[PDB]
């Protein structure tokens, strides 16, 4: 599978001068020399491998290396500007590195020549593929020095906080650093720098770490069974350092036994620490850390060692508090990326000069286009239209294109009646009923059922009862007291078990009702009941709507650091397109490919044919949640899976497939060159800003489209990569269409950051996790949706 080449440059849209956090990189037309490295012991951290290669290039210059400045990737790849005085045969080294001294055994063997002259030719002529070996060697060199001075996390670099302190609770703090990647861009290799931020464990005593994990201000008690387990799940695997002697250990368990009782070869840990170091423990009632050999360390002689990133999932408070500590307006990020570049001074890097690399000082300028927003057609008495302004519109004076007449509905309140008495319930429904009629969705009757409930165990008997008592019941409105295990059980019973539409509202939004909040509720409700909010004005769409076409969205969500991975593929069931049907699966954890894609597409194609009595001549497939590097393997499997579904439906059914990867997880940031064109308090680029030049691929079909308005922080322009196009789109035709699909998202009268198909697949995969809350065949059954609900947009 060869990716389609760029068919052309887009032409539609008002021009806008832009700055991008890409920096031009100039490399000489020279060969570089690539050697493979073997270090024994062979399973050491990359930070250790760099200390090994550093020692030997420091201590073996006369025999090999000499005045060369090699560059190293922390693993097995090492690159020099000129070839080492070695043949094809291996060269072994005995290295001893200073805590205490470790002896290492290192082997180097010649591998191959990497041509940067070849990388020049692909960027000018495109007659060969971009040589990844040339790009890899360039990235290793430009980041070798940072890898020796900072803490690498992925493609980022962090340093310990100096002066500042952004605690997250639970023993975790925030480290600020930067991202650095090297990609090719039409007119040169580009160095991509951005500000980055991730969580780390505080360098604090284990006692203090235990208190933050368990919430305690130190009133002596031992740890309960619940506390011992939760403390174990947080510190297991981490590393600690001792203070009584200065060694370092990896924690493998927490003893079920306190320090005064935990024994070993006979002798308790408390007496052993008295019988030596003359330490009388201040917390012998607390457990020890096990570091299976039987070595135990009490919590008070151990500190958490700094530099340990936190891969575990953060609480709702911890993500909210980190968002606030890291969000800066777009101009603020500009000057910060500029600060990092001045600090970097890449042209004065000795390793960058070794390979003759030259880095451009200022951010790349590029002229993008602000695409024109589509017009949304509403219905009702007025048949009004919506003209988006700054990627936003409202419902004022508009009714739904197809409004659902709500005749039978029930209310289930799960907050205590002390907090939500009858008087505030009546006011809520009255306000909602009025706004629902305004939007063309008449909530006509009073609730045929309205009771107070308590506990998640009451929803199924009550929902079973509602389905049996009230014929023609359309909606259940469930009022919840904040975060609760009732929401999952409401969705599990409603979506998977009984097939009943449900709209959950938080009790906080019932006591105080905003008309905007009520309007956003009806947007979901009308669609949960099979309605249509708006449609794209038809005659302003792409020509792919002249024949039957289906739009698919796809996403894969993985479990946090054995839960399964969840794949979701949604399919347009109409020609607007507005109504989407959903399919969902579970698969083994951390498999990026949608294994069941072939049959999931088959189900969507069959549902499309039942809803329209048409067979799609084209398939537009937006794929979300893709990591680069596995992209060829994902497309190969999934593009054949889509084709295989069509082969198994009819003997000679060959619709054209467009496969587009939607990437929001990247560090490409765009900025207004003119300050007068900054929009909002955040000062971001306008909604609809498109870029398909200067920073995109030399000869392949990709573009950036920031389809949304940036409320806070710096906007993330979505990158779109066309991997297959049987339908032979033009650049304008596909960029406008991607932008119009960003205006068909039902949960808000706004233009969102990714197309509605891809966003729905995300919602379906998240809803599947609430369905999996309390065997692969049993896991597969839990995400299956009731036959009444498959036919609707429950995930809204």
């Amino acid at each position: 599978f060869q990716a389609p080449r760029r068919p052309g440059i887009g032409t539609v849209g008002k021009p806008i001068k832009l700055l991008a956090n890409y920096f031009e990189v100039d490399i000489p037309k020279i060969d570089v020399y690539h050697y493979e490295v073997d270090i024994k012991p062979d399973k050491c951290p990359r930070r250790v491998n760099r200390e090994v290669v550093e020692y030997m290039v420091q201590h073996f210059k006369p025999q090999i290396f000499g005045d060369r400045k090699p560059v190293y990737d922390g693993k097995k790849n090492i690159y020099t500007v000129t070839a080492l005085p070695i043949g094809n045969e291996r060269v072994d080294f005995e290295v001893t590195i200073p805590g205490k001294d470790r002896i290492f055994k290192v082997s180097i063997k010649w591998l191959a020549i990497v041509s940067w002259r070849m990388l020049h030719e692909a960027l000018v002529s495109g007659q060969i593929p971009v040589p990844l070996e040339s790009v890899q060697a360039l990235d290793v060199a430009m980041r070798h020095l940072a890898s020796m001075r900072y803490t690498p996390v992925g493609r980022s670099f962090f340093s310990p906080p100096e002066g500042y302190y952004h605690p997250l609770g639970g023993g975790r703090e925030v480290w600020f650093g930067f991202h650095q990647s090297v990609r090719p861009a039409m007119w040169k290799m580009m160095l991509n720098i951005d500000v980055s931020a991730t969580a780390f464990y505080k360098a604090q005593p284990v006692i203090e770490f235990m208190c933050e994990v368990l919430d305690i201000r130190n009133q002596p008690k031992p740890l309960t069974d619940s506390q011992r387990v939760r403390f174990t799940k947080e510190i297991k695997g981490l590393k600690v350092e001792v203070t009584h002697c200065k060694r370092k250990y990896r924690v493998c368990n927490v003893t079920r036994r306190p320090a005064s009782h935990q024994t070993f070869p006979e002798c308790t840990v408390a007496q052993y620490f008295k019988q030596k170091y003359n330490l009388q423990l201040k917390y012998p009632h607390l457990p020890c850390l096990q570091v299976q050999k039987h070595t135990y360390l009490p919590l008070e002689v151990c500190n958490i060692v700094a530099g340990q990133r936190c891969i575990k999932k953060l609480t709702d408070n911890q993500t909210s508090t980190m968002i606030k500590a890291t969000a800066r307006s777009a101009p603020d990020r500009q000057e910060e990326i500029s600060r990092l570049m001045k600090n970097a001074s890449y042209n004065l890097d000795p390793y960058i000069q070794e390979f003759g690399i030259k880095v451009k000082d200022d951010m790349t300028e590029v002229t993008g286009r602000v695409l024109p927003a589509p017009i949304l057609q509403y219905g009702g008495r007025n048949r009004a239209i919506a003209t988006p302004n700054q990627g936003v519109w409202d419902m004022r004076g508009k009714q739904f294109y197809n409004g659902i007449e709500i005749k039978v509905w029930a209310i289930a309140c799960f907050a205590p009646q002390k907090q939500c008495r009858e008087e505030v319930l009546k006011n809520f429904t009255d306000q909602l009923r009025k706004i629902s009629k305004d939007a063309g969705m008449p909530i006509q009757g009073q609730p045929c059922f309205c009771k107070y409930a308590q506990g998640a165990d009451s929803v199924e008997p009550m929902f079973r009862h509602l389905k049996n008592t009230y014929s023609g019941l359309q909606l259940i409105i469930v009022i919840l007291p904040g975060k609760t295990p009732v929401y999952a059980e409401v969705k599990r019973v409603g979506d998977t078990l009984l097939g009943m539409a449900t709209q959950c509202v938080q009790v906080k939004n019932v006591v105080k009702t905003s008309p905007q909040t009520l309007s956003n509720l009806c947007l979901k409700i009308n669609v949960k009941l099979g309605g249509i909010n708006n449609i794209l004005v038809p005659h302003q769409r792409s020509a792919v709507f002249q024949q039957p076409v289906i739009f698919l969205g796809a996403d894969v969500t993985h479990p946090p650091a054995k839960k399964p991975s969840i794949t979701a593929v949604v399919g347009s069931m109409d020609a607007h397109p507005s109504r989407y049907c959903a399919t969902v699966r579970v698969q083994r954890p951390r498999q990026e490919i949608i294994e069941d894609l072939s049959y999931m597409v088959r189900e969507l194609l069959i549902q499309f044919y039942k809803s329209t009595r048409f067979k799609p001549t084209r398939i537009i497939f937006y794929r979300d949640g893709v990591p680069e590097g596995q992209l060829p393997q994902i497309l190969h499997y999934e593009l054949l899976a889509i084709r295989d579904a069509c082969i198994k439906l009819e003997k000679d059914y060959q619709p054209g497939i467009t496969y587009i990867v939607v990437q929001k997880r990247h560090h490409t940031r765009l900025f207004c060159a003119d300050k007068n064109e900054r929009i909002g308090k955040s000062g971001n680029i306008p909604a609809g800003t498109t870029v398909d030049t200067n920073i995109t691929h030399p000869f392949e079909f990709d573009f950036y489209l920031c389809s949304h308005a940036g409320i806070q922080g710096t906007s993330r322009p979505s990158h779109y990569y066309v991997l297959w196009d049987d339908n032979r789109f033009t650049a304008d035709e596909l960029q406008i269409l991607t932008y119009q699909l960003c205006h068909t998202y039902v949960r808000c009268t706004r233009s969102v950051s990714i197309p509605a198909p891809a966003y729905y697949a995300r919602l379906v995969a998240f809803r599947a996790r609430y369905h999996l809350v309390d065997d692969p065949q049993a896991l597969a059954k839990a995400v299956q949706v009731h036959q009444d609900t498959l036919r609707t947009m429950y995930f809204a």
């Binding site: 197809n402 024949q547 039957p548 044919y609 048409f614």
Partner: peptide
């Protein structure tokens, strides 16, 4: 509502389903 107006609902193909 229609979801159609491609015209020509066709009774000339296997019924899938």
């Amino acid at each position: 509502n229609g979801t159609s107006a491609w015209g020509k609902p066709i009774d000339s193909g296997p019924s899938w389903g």
